[model samples]
Target: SEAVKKWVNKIIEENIIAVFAKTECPYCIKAISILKGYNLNSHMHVENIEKNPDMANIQAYLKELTGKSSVPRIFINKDVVGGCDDLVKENDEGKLKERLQKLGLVN
Candidate 1:
């Protein structure tokens, strides 16, 4: 638990954009592609859910911190940007670019 907590904090703390994802999830792949469009794909810290055995607990903790338990849990400057749908919605509404610009990820 300590390790997961530590891992989570470190990843979040270290990046302005981050995505906690399961490698096999199509939504996750799509989310990353969206990020790539902003040239922020490398800037995003991706934690593949399959990498850890305690990943479910990690997801549970993330759910506690945010509200959803789905993969492709995206964060922008440590703020919960929600899952794939939320990301797409934000992008569709043109809010995602504003957020990224504020974070200086985009000009």
Candidate 2:
């Protein structure tokens, strides 16, 4: 399963950005585009929760971490960043910039 694969990989790879979402979601598309704008693709993994049952585990794990299961979910250095509006709000207010710096995406 990509879940287990990604889980093992994250531990060893120092991945900073991971997205859990379903295909055909406009918010997910926008989020992906936003991340691409930063050229930060290497660590980003998009899981289609609507298509894969196991992929739902990612959402469950997120809920375990954040107390809410939501798509368009973002993580930095494996830290939960809430959902779409949270991201847009953070980025708009430049809080996401601080988060990036904290994750070593910037200094």
Candidate 3:
């Protein structure tokens, strides 16, 4: 558990955007697509649960980190930015680009 927490913290600290997702999750695909669309995927770290056998513990710790255990749990600048629908909502509202620009991920 502590190891997982440490791993999660390392991931968040290292990346400006982090996504904890399941490999087969459609929502995860959607979220990744959106980020990749802006080329922001370069700075995004995606932890695919299905690929990592130890992800159960990691996901549990992530619940405490983000207040939700759902896959597609996203972090921008180490802050919880919600899941797939939330990503789409932010993009639709034009706030996603604004946030990206603030992070210098976009012009």
Candidate 4:
């Protein structure tokens, strides 16, 4: 339903950084820790897709927007940045930090 779709949009739209994560996914855990290590001065929203109150609905919305219903769909400024390794690639290349600084999200 559009309800979950709207819910998904609202979270990303409100947060400067938002990560769609699954609590038990190893890649999700690593991605989260990597993002945390940045120490960026902004609140990062991590949605536990695995334990969401409406997991099925949320999961469906994810695939609809991202084209892949996978966790660790990191977002910056409400736009998705891909999956786990995808994040590491950007973070390692300094793109992540660069993006945050551009957004004035870093100290």
Candidate 5:
């Protein structure tokens, strides 16, 4: 149980700015590019939820977390922040900065 908790917690911690989107999706590319611009590699754990059978567990976990089955969904600071376009909009505006400050990544 400890090991499982560690694994899940590691996933949560490593992905302070997590986006659950497919690699090939245009929105995914845009989101990654925006994140990269921020100089944070932002560990993107790909799920391939659209085409992979092995991702059922992660899908279930995401559903439990976000209450939906949408790819390009996201998590920020261990909370659901929604999809790609939403993130980009936040990035374009000043909300993303507010978020980073809330996370203590910016001064």
Candidate 6:
């Protein structure tokens, strides 16, 4: 684990929904909007990496692995749920709600 994977692991391993996003990206906003609609607000890590010092290296690193290196890199339970459209698809299929509802159980 170097910069990207290490950073990724630290976030995803600790949270249920890890979202790497930009502050004002349309997709980012939409992705977050969708999540908010799901009524979930726990075990989630949402980062606006737009101004992070490691922005460049992080993008390059993600490109190396995830192949897109775009804003709104989303993960669920350590699984790569991909971008905004991907997320929409997941929610459309009901997996996102199911998983979050389980987490929303909160013991």
lDDT of each prediction vs. the true structure?
0.88, 0.72, 0.86, 0.81, 0.66, 0.77
TM-scores of the models, in the given order? 0.93, 0.75, 0.91, 0.87, 0.69, 0.81
The candidate 4 region of ten consecutive residues with least summed lDDT is 34-43
Clashing residue pairs found in predicted model 4:
none
Q: Highest TM-score: which candidate?
A: 1
Give the top-scoring candidate (lDDT): 1
Off by over 4 Å in 5: 1-9, 42-53
TM-score of 2: 0.75
lDDT of 2: 0.72
**Local error of candidate 1 at 103, Å?**
1.4
User: What count of clashes does model 4 give?
Assistant: 0
Badly placed stretches (over 4 Å) of model 2 are 1-14
Q: What is the C-alpha RMSD of each candidate to the true structure, in Å?
A: 1.1, 3.5, 1.3, 1.7, 3.6, 2.5
Candidate 2 residue lDDT tens string, 1-107 = 56665673464246578777787899888887887777678767776667865666766766776777777777777676778787888889998888777767666
Instruction: Give one digit per residue, the lDDT tens place, for model 4 in 1-107.
Output: 67878888988898888888887789988888888887743678888877878887887777777777878787888677888888888988989888888887675
lDDT of 3 by residue, 1-107 (tens): 67778888888899999988886799999898889899986798988865786877877787877777889889899877889888899999998999999999999
Off by over 4 Å in 6: 1-4, 101-107
Model 4 has an lDDT value of: 0.81
Candidate 6 residue lDDT tens string, 42-105? 6567887777878877777666656789988887777788899998887889777777777663
User: What does candidate 5's lDDT look like per residue over 6-106, in tens digits?
Assistant: 55456666777666665478876777677666765644444345564435556566677777656776777777767777787887798987887787766
| Candidate 2 vs candidate 5, lDDT winner | 2
User: Where is the poorest 10-residue window by lDDT in model 5?
Assistant: 1-10
Candidate 1 deviant stretches above 4 angstroms: none
Model 2: lDDT of residue 18: 75
> Residue pairs in steric clash, candidate 2?
none
* Each model's total of backbone clashes: 0, 0, 0, 0, 0, 0
Runs of candidate 3 with Cα error greater than 4 angstroms are none
